Structures are given as C-alpha cells and as structure tokens.
Design a protein around this nucleic acid. Structure first.
Lengths: 123, 123
DNA sequence: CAGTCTAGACATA
DNA sequence: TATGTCTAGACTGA
C-alpha cells in the first residue's frame, strides 16, 4: 500500500536487516501521519520533490530522539537519509529552509520530518 | 559477584539464550534489591532455604507483570521457577504460605518474590 | 553522543 | 484472563 509505494522512492540502503528496518521506519511515520491527516502531503513531497510543501509534522520527545525497531535517532535525520541522502552522517550536515516553522532546531512540540525542508550543508 | 553466586543455585534451565536470560533475570532482581537493602535476605533465603525468611519484595506494576530481556512474566513465577521448580507452568501451581504479607494475590504495592514463601500445588 | 532496558500503552483473544 | 509488541523515558556511561 502507501508504505510499499513510499519505500519505492529509495527503499533502504545497507545490506541486510536494513531494508526490513527501513520498512519499519516508514511504517511508524505512516501510522502517525494517518492519525493527523498528513499522509498525502508526505506522498506529494516525496514524489513531486517540491520544497515548498506543507510541514509534515511528528511530535517531539523530551530528548528529541525517535526509536524504530531498536534503533534510536533524530526524526529528521532518519527520513532525510531515507529519501534524500543515504550518506547523511549527523544532524550537523543539515539545515532547515526558513519556510519550515517546526524545523527541529526550534525546539517546538512538533518536528518537521518533511525531507524537502532541509538542505545538506557540507559545513 | 552476588549474581554469579545466586545464579549458582540453579543457573538456568533451557538450552541457549536461556542461561543468558536467567542472568539478566537475576541482575534485575539484584539491582532493585540493592536499592532497598534486601539483597542479603535474598542471599539467606536461596542458600539456607529457610521458609521463614523476610519477604523479599519488589514493586508491583499496573498489570502485575515483569519484563526481563523482552520476556514478560509474573514476578513470583519467574523466580520460583528459577531456584525451585523449573517445571512451573503458571501462577496457578503456586500458593503463598500465610506468613507472606505481600503474597501477590493480595494485590499490594509490593510483591514478595522470595521463592521460599510459595508452595507448589499440584492442584 | 549513543547504546541498553522495560513499564506502560496498545490491541486482541 | 491472558499475552504479545512497540517505544518514550530513564538509566549508564565513558
């Protein structure tokens, strides 16, 4: 369904339990977005690659990490790495685009995980 | 240390990840008991097998289950099975000894996990 | 800066 | 009842 499709745009790089984990990671995002009705703005953004899409938002946690499968990480890094930069090392190689209100660095209650609202800085 | 020792009195039956699990299971118990100074009454009860030892208590949870390693279970069953009856199927083949105030069935804030305050009923 | 652990939250059966 | 799965929050570090 939506998951298999979204996965289509860069299933998951790394040999092994990684493809399965990438699937789990898409599943979490999709489950949460359904609840808030943003699954389609996600669908648009990944496919059309339109930087000026609405902010696809997920709730933040005290420490700001997200756990999928076992694996703990920053929301926006997990997804920019999934659909844009599989090379992405950390949240330092990233920076929002002013047009993102909930751009993580703003410590808001929601976090924009729309991969097209961040640009990768080579520092 | 204390864990390697207490483990000694029935390390852990089942082939495999079990022996490692039984070790995790004793580590949980020992960690909690240290915080409340009951590790020695545990030490005494397991070694001396004295039924009339103090009630070794662990805090109960809403559902009353305890999770060790992944594996969910009832406190008193996981421990009676560890140093008494490895055959123990469920919490029905068990019953307190009147002398245990926090004998689980009493739905108190604490749960007596002293394996020598329960007796196995063959129903 | 990051890896482990588990009660409590679900969601059935 | 009874039971399995998933993770935010806590804890542990070095």
């Amino acid at each position: 369904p939506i998951v298999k499709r979204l996965l289509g745009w860069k299933k998951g790089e790394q040999n092994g339990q990684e493809e399965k984990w990438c699937e789990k990671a898409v599943k979490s995002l999709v489950k949460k977005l359904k609840k808030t009705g943003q699954l389609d703005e996600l669908e648009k953004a990944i496919t059309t690659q339109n930087v000026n899409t609405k902010c696809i938002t997920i709730p933040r946690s005290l420490d700001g990490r997200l756990q999928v499968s076992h694996r703990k990480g920053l929301p926006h890094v997990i997804y920019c790495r999934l659909w844009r930069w599989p090379d992405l090392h950390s949240h330092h190689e990233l920076r929002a685009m002013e047009l993102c209100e909930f751009a993580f660095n703003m410590k808001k209650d929601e976090v924009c995980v729309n991969p097209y609202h961040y640009q990768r800085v080579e520092t």
